[PDB]
Amino acid sequence: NSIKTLSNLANLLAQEGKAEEAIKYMRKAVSLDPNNIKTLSNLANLLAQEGKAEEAIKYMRKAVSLDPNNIKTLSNLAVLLAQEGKAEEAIKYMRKAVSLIDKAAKG
Amino acid sequence: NSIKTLSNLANLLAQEGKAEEAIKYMRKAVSLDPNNIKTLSNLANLLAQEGKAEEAIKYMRKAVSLDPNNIKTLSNLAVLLAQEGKAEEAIKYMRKAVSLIDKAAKG
């Protein structure tokens, strides 16, 4: 599993303060399967950690656009936006997740 | 960093379908610093993946109790509860996270 290996390598590089390299390997992981929401989310989180907030938000928004009713992706985007000082924007995404949980409760 | 090493080992064991072993090493990681919200959350997610839903929820609830205003922990607990068929319980946690984002927006 090349996505797995690249993701593991990126994690190890980031853990040890080589996150520019980590980002490169996570980008490669995305190219191997660009529709993988988990890879997209992992790259976004790494980007955010490294101060690339604009790009992180773009990637997390992409992950949402590819499955807009996913409460995990929605809440991750909300948390990312809030942490990046865009709480006003963040709240509509977390409210969407609430509404989807509410729908689930209703069945 | 023993928590790091144990967490890496657990990830590698789980990735390769030895998640009973992974859980043991994640439990060890928690014992090294039981107040670490990230370790607690990581163990909870692993537990949930392995069908130990009750225990996963306990650990994620603990992570929330140790920092009850953390929107990441709250939204993770909500997502976990929803995925485990407890959407009604899940919604109060995600609504709390919304309210905290709302407070943040207001400053």
Numbering used by the authors:
A (entry chain A), B (entry chain A): 1 to 107
Give passages from the manuscript.
One of these highly populated repetitive folds is the αα-solenoid (SCOP a.118), whose most widespread superfamily is the tetratricopeptide repeat (TPR; a.118.8). The ﬁrst crystal structure of a TPR domain showed that the repeat units are helical hairpins, stacked into a continuous, right-handed superhelical architecture with an inner groove that mediates the interaction with target proteins. Here we show that such hairpins are detectable and that one of them, from the ribosomal protein RPS20, can be customized to yield a TPR fold by repetition, with only a small number of point mutations that are neutral for the parent organism. We concatenated three copies of RPS20-hhta as an initial construct, connected by the TPR consensus loop sequence (DPNN).
